[PDB]
A paper describes a structure:
It catalyzes the reversible phosphorolysis of uracil ribosides and analogous compounds to their respective nucleobases and ribose-1-phosphate. Humans possess two isoforms of UPP (hUPP1 & hUPP2) of which hUPP1 is more widely distributed, more abundantly expressed, and better characterized. hUPP1 has been a subject of interest to cancer researchers due to its role in the activation of pyrimidine nucleoside analogues used in chemotherapy, such as 5-fluorouracil (5-FU) and its prodrug, capecitabine. In contrast to expectations, hUPP1 is dimeric, having lost the higher order assembly (trimer-of-dimers) that results in hexameric rings in more primitive UPPs.
In the present study, we have determined the crystallographic structure of hUPP1 at high resolution, both in ligand-free and BAU-bound conformations. Specifically, one of the three pocket arginine residues (Arg64 in hUPP1) is bent away from the anion, leaving only two coordinating guanidinium groups, one from each subunit of the dimer, to bind the substrate. This finding may imply that in the human enzyme this residue has been adapted to ligand recruitment from the cytoplasm rather than ligand binding in the active site. Determination of both ligand-free and BAU-bound forms of hUPP1 allows direct analysis of the conformational changes induced in the enzyme upon substrate binding. To this end, there are only subtle differences in the fold and residue orientation between overlaid monomers of hUPP1. Another implication of the loss of hexameric structure appears to be that the human enzyme possesses greater inter-domain flexibility than its microbial counterparts. However, the 'open' conformation of hUPP1 provides the opportunity to potentially develop a novel class of allosteric inhibitors of this enzyme that lock the protein in a functionally disabled form, with its catalytic residues too separated to lyse substrates.
Numbering used by the authors:
A (entry chain A), B (entry chain A): 16 to 310
């Protein structure tokens, strides 16, 4: 009913398409039979996070078998692992806008070639919080830039193309519901600032280059807060932009590992951090299980 | 004589510094004894490229031993591997501006803590050529943006900071000399366009999103060419910017794998591609061996 769509007329005019970073191709792979049942896609930085994710969701669905399962489906690029169980796909996207951007182009084409429809896609991860306790889950309403605007700027053949970065409103409400229902941890909705850079792009004071003070950083974070920002990470903006353009229902669910208004490093004990790390996974696998119990 | 420098007053005011992505710290590691002899640093995308690099350079220097050597020095982040042989360091930086940017912040601090001076740093890699035969080596004069300008734009606490992206002129001349001396492959000097994005950022026609034609892409590439651009990759701009700011003598040496003025995919046979892949390594290890025979 909402099919995945490409916005590229050149594709229809091709002999074959190779998804270079997955080593999948239209000449060799039957996409509809492989991926046509896919309804939920979860994405995150590392293969180990996405592998823990698929094992959690498989157990929840009763699809967990005694053998050596959830094999990586794809190849050629270590940054990208892909796992599948029933209607769920779990894909790592690596670090930074360029790395997730390549993955999303090829993922969206995969899902298009598979004739997927009504696809929900959710990014999970960690983030620095602004004015929240360590361990709070943020469901992103808009993924904003360094001026706190809901816009992603892409340069296309030397020209600025501005795309909006709203997450899917209904999906946001559904995730918030799941969380209020679970009542296992503080969850808020807020905006998420997506930076390109970690040391200077986030107002950290420990870079090789820094032209500002603690006091300068605090003023900037206080302004981000007043503009609706609750957390900071590095992949959400391009994620949001491309997913709505191509007809995917997108959300971002990040846990905070610290409050940047109190300084730049993580105080929580190892055992505490490790329970925070599982929070986005907990919410999203619970949400998927709920959705597949009402289907 | 040219010491590595930090441009960060906050550092002097710290108890300890942790290089998070290398798992190295000032409280545990004696940086001057570990890295103070470092004069040459080669950087590239993948651990396997940088591991092939260090083994090539070690053999050239007579430092290659019969045992299981060039162990990865660092840990905690798969994207970053670090190898050392004599005064040479080889470091992988992963894919895209954000990933190399984190590595460079921590590398520059490492070299500063080690009290390194007269450090030459060189990025090796592959690229798409503009108006060059497949397999041509480009020594980058300036790493330019999507409008072909020698500038890198960084957002710092919401503000535009523009930094210049010239490579070190003298290093460029020295590398060109080594290449004319070797006479093993076509080498040019030219500008290198650094894009953030691969599918749309480079005018490719096979993205999930594409608002332009073959004819549009060609006009853009022809304009890049007329502005001095000879190749396209994804890490050189921030590399150039940060290295001159911090007192490193920087160069970029990329081989071209195709001519984008003839289309978007790589025609060369596997055996040919594999010999191209070694060209940047060949030039740079030869250059280092030359430098260490005149010391
Ligand atoms: Mg891309
Ligand atoms: Mg950085």
């Amino acid at each position: 009913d909402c099919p995945v769509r490409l916005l590229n007329p050149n594709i229809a005019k091709m002999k074959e398409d190779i998804l270079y970073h997955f080593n999948l191709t239209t000449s060799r792979h039957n996409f509809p039979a492989l991926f046509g049942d896919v309804k939920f896609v979860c994405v995150g930085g590392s293969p180990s996070r996405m592998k823990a994710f698929i094992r959690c969701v498989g157990a929840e669905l009763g699809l967990d078998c005694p053998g050596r399962d959830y094999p990586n489906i794809c190849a050629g690029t270590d940054r990208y692992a892909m796992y599948k169980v029933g209607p769920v796909l779990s894909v790592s996207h690596g670090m930074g806008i360029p790395s997730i951007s390549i993955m999303l182009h090829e993922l969206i084409k995969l899902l298009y070639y598979a004739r997927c429809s009504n696809v929900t896609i959710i990014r999970i991860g960690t983030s620095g919080g602004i004015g929240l306790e360590p361990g709070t889950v943020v469901i992103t309403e808009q993924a904003v830039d360094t001026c706190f605007k809901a816009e992603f700027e892409q340069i296309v053949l030397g020209k600025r193309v501005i795309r909006k970065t709203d997450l899917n409103k209904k999906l946001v409400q559904e995730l918030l519901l799941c969380s209020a229902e679970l009542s296992e941890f503080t969850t808020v909705v807020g905006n998420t600032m997506c930076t390109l850079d970690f040391y200077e792009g986030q107002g950290r004071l420990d870079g090789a280059l820094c032209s500002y003070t603690e006091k300068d950083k605090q003023a900037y974070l206080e302004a981000a807060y007043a503009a609706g920002v609750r957390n900071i990470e590095m992949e959400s903006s391009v994620f949001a932009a491309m997913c709505s353009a191509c007809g995917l229902q997108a959300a971002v669910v990040c846990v905070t590992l610290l409050n940047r208004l109190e300084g730049d490093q993580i105080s929580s004990p190892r055992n505490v951090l490790s329970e925070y790390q599982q929070r986005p996974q907990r919410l999203v696998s619970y949400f998927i299980k709920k959705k597949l119990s009402k289907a």
